[PDB]
Amino acid sequence: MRQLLLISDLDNTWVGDQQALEHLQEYLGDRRGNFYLAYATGRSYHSARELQKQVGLMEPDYWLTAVGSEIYHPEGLDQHWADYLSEHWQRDILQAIADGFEALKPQSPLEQNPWKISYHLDPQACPTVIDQLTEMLKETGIPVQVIFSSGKDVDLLPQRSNKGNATQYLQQHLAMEPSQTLVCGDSGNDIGLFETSARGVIVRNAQPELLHWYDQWGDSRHYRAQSSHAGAILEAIAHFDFLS
Ligand SMILES: O=P(O)(O)OC[C@H]1O[C@@](CO)(O[C@H]2O[C@H](CO)[C@@H](O)[C@H](O)[C@H]2O)[C@@H](O)[C@@H]1O
């Protein structure tokens, strides 16, 4: 029932520029009840609360963590979303396949969960191996989705997960219109947000994969901010004339 559903990425988007994070949160603090806020990050919920303590993030209404593999309500984890993502998912098999790749190194255990298998790509490896990985996984019949960001982070999630779907799920839950939604991002794990029908803002300092994506799929609901980090978010709000 609010006029805006603000969905932002953390690293290099909401966070990265303190002065901006501060004047963004200062502005949004004078009309806190006019929007719902959701952080969409690739970080675990624990690693996310940590960030909030370091940079002083403002308390969001929802936390779309681990690339949307987990959604945290004020009350707590969403078990319907979990069951939704658990359906047809075969973590063991997918991992067996992913591990078979030399160019891939498993990320620390604390970066994994029932619906998120992550690795790091060798700096000297050939990025096309990701496309080989994607295809090899796809052909298993298991609804899997490969996410590549920052040229090194590789995430294997269910087709039904990822920041964009997590966002769509939330939209329906809150009964919010795409026209009333704004997504903010900078990397490849943000692509799913822009695949959404919501309004979007790509921070100036965006990563190459996102900018590359934009060139090919960017539409009219996609705004390329002139500013970087939090500044992009304030700019996009003025652009789409949100919070009128
Ligand atoms: O998703 P962001 O909020 O934009 O954070 C990106 C940043 O997070 C780090 C820090 O741990 O890694 C997280 O995100 C990647 C990509 O989704 C995952 O593969 C990784 O497991 C997760 O911890 C960092 O690598 C990213 O730049």
TrEMBL record:
Record-level Gene Ontology MF annotations: magnesium ion binding; sucrose-phosphate phosphatase activity
Assigned EC number: 3.1.3.24
Keywords assigned by UniProt, alphabetized: Hydrolase, Metal-binding
Gene3D superfamilies according to UniProt: 3.90.1070.10, HAD superfamily/HAD-like (3.40.50.1000)
Keyword Hydrolase attributed: yes
Reaction catalysed by this enzyme: sucrose 6(F)-phosphate + H2O = sucrose + phosphate
Keyword Mitochondrion: no
CDD domains: HAD_SPP
InterPro entries linked to this entry: HAD-like_sf, HAD-SF_hydro_IIB, HAD_sf, SPP-like_dom, Sucrose_Phosphatase, Sucrose_phosphatase_pln/cyn
UniProt: Mg(2+) 2 binding residues: 9, 186-187, 189-190
Domain of life: Bacteria
Residues that hold Mg(2+) 1 according to the record: 9, 11, 186
GO biological process, one term: sucrose biosynthetic process
Sucrose phosphatase-like domain location: 3-241
Protein's pathway: Glycan biosynthesis; sucrose biosynthesis; sucrose from D-fructose 6-phosphate and UDP-alpha-D-glucose: step 2/2
Cofactor(s) required, per the database record: Mg(2+)
NCBIfam families linked: HAD-SF-IIB, SPP-subfamily, SPP_plant-cyano
Family: Belongs to the sucrose phosphatase family.
Protein name: sucrose-phosphate phosphatase
Lineage, highest ranks first: Bacteria, Bacillati, Cyanobacteriota, Cyanophyceae, Synechococcales
